[PDB]
A paper describes a structure:
This indicates that the folding of apo-rHLFr is preserved even after the accumulation of Au(III) ions and the crosslink treatment. All of the Au binding sites in the ferritin cage are divided into three deposition regions; the three-fold axis channel (Site-A), the metal accumulation site (Site-B) and at Met96 (Site-C). At Site-A, there are two Au atoms, one of which (Au1) is coordinated by Cys126 and a water molecule. The other Au ion (Au2) at Site-A is coordinated by both His114 and Cys126. Cys126 forms a bridge between Au1 and Au2, giving Au–Sγ(Cys) distances of 2.39 and 2.26 Å, respectively. At Site-C, Au6 and Au7 are coordinated by His147 and Met96.
Using this concept, we replaced the Glu45 and Arg52 residues of recombinant L-chain apo-Fr from horse liver (apo-rHLFr) by Cys and the resulting apo-rHLFr mutant apo-E45C/R52C-rHLFr was used in the current study. In summary, we have demonstrated structural evidence for the formation of an Au sub-nanocluster inside the narrow three-fold symmetric channel of the apo-ferritin cage.
Numbering used by the authors:
A (entry chain X), B (entry chain X), C (entry chain X), D (entry chain X), E (entry chain X): 3 to 172
Write the structure that this text describes.
């Protein structure tokens, strides 16, 4: 047995977080393909969400690797379908993405609180190194996007949405 | 004689398809030069249609090479003049181009049905390799274009049409 | 509209196949992490299943890209959890993997039958190019594995299982 | 004086941990040379333990450097002789090594608890960066080894022990 | 003593100018970080003001080096906080920046008048070489910016402000 100072509570929460990251990966996959539709056709938005799907999957994989390193047991649940089938405008889509990220971020913070209450400094080290700072960085980028997109709507939302995709998401 | 398993029906239809591809090449030549007019002056649109003229010509040449490989006889008809002399807006032009492509694509599908009814798997192999997938890809690109162009019209179509040429057709 | 010669039946079946490939990806993710457990510890098996997870995901993505190219609409369902939580021996795991692959392969064949009944030669071209041959190749590799693993059990299954991982899965 | 926010309790515990790491280095030195005996002759095991002796020494040196950076005073005690003179089988030896590592790891965790009770975030930063994650990684590797070694014993332990040294420890 | 032909009046004025350049550096630091806010999010504006903060600091350092070369004594005062906490639009910000620069430029001219009234040609050489021409160049660039920004407001200031940041400040 390698397991040491690793509570069943953290073990479970790590499995839930894996599910959350995979689910987020799935939502980004759906977002990306929506923006590749011929009647939506915003290549740069598709690319942004494609790349985020990959980052969320990698996040899940790192959590799983850590679960195994600590002697926990990975348990997988169903991955729920994304919350929408069609995602509206780039604005709507980025708002949905920032909500998703804040929910992941909250999950990360809830796991840190569980970790320090269980006195598990390896878990706290792991989250800090690979998750907390990356999530903060991403949420700041999405907020920046949302601000630019919002500035671009009003009289001519079609024009704004094109320009954003062409000149920011490039 | 090399001819084997090659019906006179397919032979004829291959000649008609050559005519269609050459005609499409001609239409794209007209489209390209219209957008090079000093009073139209959309370089990127001209370039898009120039390149499509070349692809349609190459398509015809591949069909002809295949006609000869199978022991058929190439027969050439008049190439009808393009359906318009002036092509309106970039939007009008891309709509005309997508109609043209759907008609070529239908011709390709009608030739596949003729081919499997005649049990001619070499013909079916040929269309799949060089035509069906390329045409699908092209029609998806035109649909994407049309969606972006449409999004760019409304209050200021002049501005939209410039931006599309400068930032998508680059 | 780009949609041409693309039935709602094929559209639906393509969405189901995407689900199947993603589900298979998920199962391989579970398989890979099981073999990374400290009490299982077969690095080469983990690596084999990790790489298969990636190939199944790519398969799904190619199907989705094709759905969009044809003017269909991607619809995502829940991804069911893998069929086991623990996967037994390398033998048990490879048997489960070959069952999974035969089920994907059958789905591919059922989609080909639907495609020729609907006279959709672009779909048939797509499956042949990217799916049918790859799946056949993979199933042959798994059968080869299963044969070697089986040959290695009997008196000393522990020893056999180590050697296979070290000298075949390397 | 540079000393700031550095308790005498942490200072002492850091000195004890240095002793523990040096002692572990010494035990690995003994382990390595045992496996170099002509009547034991397992080169790859010797190499594994040689390299671990070096890592434990480096760990001690990093702790000492940190003791000085914080204005503590390094105090050295006797280094106790390793717990055995002969180490049995590769299995016995790896079990002893994992026990040693769990004891170091516990010492690291006890030092983290002392550090957060003393509100010494520099100490906590130091342990996380250079010790906690490395120790977790090492214990997972040893557990993996132990699992493979165990799988290889039974009918023919001699054969298993050779193969492990030749094909894993390479 | 190295001091030669260097009045106490110039010495004092050089110290005041150092203060002015540092203060300007500080204002540009504030400007840059305002435009990095998630609710402002104009990367190119931030970059423009960041680079100006650096140039003003370098200007101060060159003045200080010259103070020492002439045998004067550097005396530092408080650096007053920038004149605003929030800087409005890119237009407002560039207007504030041009006002700041005209005030620095006037200070440079007042120091030249003091220098020729004191018959201090080394001081006059120094200002000409490193300050007067650079400041003129910068003020011309800001005026050019202001003209482009102004041209871009009216019906759609959001759109104009985005485009300027994306296509001029790049
Ligand atoms: Au995408
Ligand atoms: Au994309
Ligand atoms: Au994608
Ligand atoms: Au924590
Ligand atoms: Au913690
Ligand atoms: Au974003
Ligand atoms: Au975004
Ligand atoms: Au971005
Ligand atoms: Au042209
Ligand atoms: Au052209
Ligand atoms: Au041309
Ligand atoms: Au056919
Ligand atoms: Au056929
Ligand atoms: Au097009
Ligand atoms: Au187009
Ligand atoms: Au294009
Ligand atoms: Au794996
Ligand atoms: Au692996
Ligand atoms: Au993996
Ligand atoms: Au088929
Ligand atoms: Au078919
Ligand atoms: Au296999
Ligand atoms: Au296998
Ligand atoms: Au293999
Ligand atoms: Au050794
Ligand atoms: Au050795
Ligand atoms: Au050694
Ligand atoms: Au700590
Ligand atoms: Au602490
Ligand atoms: Au080990
Ligand atoms: Au070992
Ligand atoms: Au090893
Ligand atoms: Au900045
Ligand atoms: Au910046
Ligand atoms: Au900055
Ligand atoms: Au002067
Ligand atoms: Au002068
Ligand atoms: Au400026
Ligand atoms: Au400016
Ligand atoms: Au500029």
């Amino acid at each position: 047995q390698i397991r040491q100072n690793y509570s069943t509570e953290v073990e479970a929460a790590v499995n839930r977080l894996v599910n959350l990251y995979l689910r987020a990966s799935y939502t980004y996959l759906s977002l990306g393909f929506y923006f590749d539709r011929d009647d939506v056709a915003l290549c740069g938005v598709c690319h942004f969400f494609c790349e985020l799907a990959e980052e969320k999957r990698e996040g899940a994989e790192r959590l799983l690797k850590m679960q195994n390193q600590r002697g926990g047991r990975a348990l997988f649940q169903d991955l729920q379908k994304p919350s929408q089938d069609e995602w509206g405008t780039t604005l709507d889509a980025m708002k949905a993405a920032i909500v998703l990220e804040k929910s992941l971020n909250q999950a990360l913070l809830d796991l840190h609180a569980l970790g320090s209450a269980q006195a598990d400094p390896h878990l706290c080290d792991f989250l800090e190194s690979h998750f907390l700072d990356e999530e903060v960085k991403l949420i700041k980028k999405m907020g920046d996007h949302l601000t630019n997109i919002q500035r671009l709507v009003g009289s001519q939302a079609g024009l704004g949405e094109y320009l954003f995709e062409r000149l920011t998401l490039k």
